Amino acid sequence: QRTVARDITLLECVGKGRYGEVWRGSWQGENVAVKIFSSRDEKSWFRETELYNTVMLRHENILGFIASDMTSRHSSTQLWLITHYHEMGSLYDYLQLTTLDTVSCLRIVLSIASGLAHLHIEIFGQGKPAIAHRDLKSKNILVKKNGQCCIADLGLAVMHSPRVGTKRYMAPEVLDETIQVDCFDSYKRVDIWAFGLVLWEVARRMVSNGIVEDYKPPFYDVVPNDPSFEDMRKVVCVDQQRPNIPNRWFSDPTLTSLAKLMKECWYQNPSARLTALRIKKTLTKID
Numbered sequence: 001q002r003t004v005a006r007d008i009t010l011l012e013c014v015g016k017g018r019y020g021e022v023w024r025g026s027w028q029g030e031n032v033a034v035k036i037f038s039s040r041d042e043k044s045w046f047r048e049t050e051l052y053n054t055v056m057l058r059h060e061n062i063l064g065f066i067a068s069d070m071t072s073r074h075s076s077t078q079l080w081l082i083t084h085y086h087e088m089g090s091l092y093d094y095l096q097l098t099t100l101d102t103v104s105c106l107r108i109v110l111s112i113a114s115g116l117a118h119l120h121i122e123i124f125g126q127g128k129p130a131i132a133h134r135d136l137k138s139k140n141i142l143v144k145k146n147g148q149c150c151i152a153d154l155g156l157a158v159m160h161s162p163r164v165g166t167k168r169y170m171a172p173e174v175l176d177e178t179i180q181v182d183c184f185d186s187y188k189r190v191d192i193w194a195f196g197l198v199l200w201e202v203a204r205r206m207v208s209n210g211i212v213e214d215y216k217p218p219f220y221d222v223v224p225n226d227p228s229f230e231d232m233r234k235v236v237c238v239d240q241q242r243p244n245i246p247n248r249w250f251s252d253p254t255l256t257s258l259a260k261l262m263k264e265c266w267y268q269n270p271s272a273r274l275t276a277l278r279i280k281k282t283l284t285k286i287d
């Protein structure tokens with residue numbers, strides 16, 4: 001019987017953080033991405049592994065799973081997650097340098113909405129539990145060669161049948177600790193808030209009438225870098241600020257429709273926010 005080639009050549013590091021590292025790797029000529037977890041973030045490996053052991057997600061707008069590997073070392077355990085490799089990198093990276101036209105902007109945001117609705121929706125029978133992401137942001141979205149994106153990092157995901165989200169993207173009910181933690185719909189509504197911020201980040205980079213905004217992260221003008229939980233709560237909960245919509249958007253029918261969409265992701269009342277399925281429908285009718 002058979003040879004099980006497990007050797008993965010780590011070729012270059014494309015990411016280093018408190019999470020650990022991501023490497024471009026090669027298995028059998030074929031490019032893979034290898035996330036090597038820090039000790040700090042072991043529970044993210046376990047959670048993503050537990051989810052994929054429960055349901056083998058397969059969707060064009062979800063980063064493709066290849067393998068979870070645990071290897072015993074002299075005095076530690078090494079944890080690797082192996083996925084598809086997207087050489088264009090994260091949406092965060094991509095937006096820094098690249099501007100968008102109407103077609104690319106819509107393709108990006110509809111692909112993200114598609115991936116998010118896929119996570120959110122329970123399918124009965126080759127089915128899946130409903131899933132909420134809990135850390136949606138432009139660094140957790142990859143740009144594919146075909147212009148569509150895919151959602152990455154299910155390390156905080158929750159399923160329905162001490163890692164917390166990135167503070168800059170936390171919904172008001174997370175910051176004021178009123179979120180109903182027993183309620184699955186609560187977690188979907190937290191993802192819709194974060195989606196609305198991502199839609200703002202992308203829409204800024206769409207050119208209209210020769211104008212584009214510089215890349216900025218959500219709330220760049222009202223909080224410091226690495227904003228505290230308190231910094232965010234005062235802006236989002238107490239003062240009820242929302243990202244600025246520039247005047248130039250209201251000359252462009254695509255950006256006018258997207259400003260309305262992002263407004264309906266940012267209601268203080270979580271139950272007033274649009275669903276991912278309703279966002280998809282709205283986006284298919286733009287242009």
Ligand SMILES: COc1cc(-c2cncc(-c3ccc(C4CCN(C)CC4)cc3)c2C)cc(OC)c1OC
Pocket residue numbers: 003004005006008027066067068069082
């Ligand atoms: C263990 O570890 C790793 C394994 C592999 C890997 C390498 N060659 C072949 C395989 C393979 C897949 C599937 C079957 C089927 C065929 C027969 N059918 C009736 C049931 C079983 C057999 C063999 C795998 C899974 C790659 C890895 O990394 C890319 C591994 O490390 C994470």
Ligand SMILES: COc1cc(-c2cncc(-c3ccc(C4CCN(C)CC4)cc3)c2C)cc(OC)c1OC
Pocket residue numbers: 027030066067
């Ligand atoms: C993990 O990832 C990759 C794995 C492989 C790979 C290697 N050996 C064998 C296999 C295999 C063969 C046959 C079955 C069976 C299942 C039962 N049914 C009755 C018929 C089909 C399953 C598995 C695969 C899938 C290739 C890959 O890329 C080319 C992988 O991606 C990097």
Ligand SMILES: COc1cc(-c2cncc(-c3ccc(C4CCN(C)CC4)cc3)c2C)cc(OC)c1OC
Pocket residue numbers: 014015022033034035081082083084085086087088089090093139140141142152153154
């Ligand atoms: C968010 O999360 C995960 C992401 C990935 C992932 C998948 N494809 C590609 C990448 C990537 C490749 C290349 C660049 C740069 C380097 C070269 N040049 C300067 C431009 C582009 C950036 C990023 C990553 C980081 C894998 C993961 O796990 C294995 C992730 O975690 C789940």
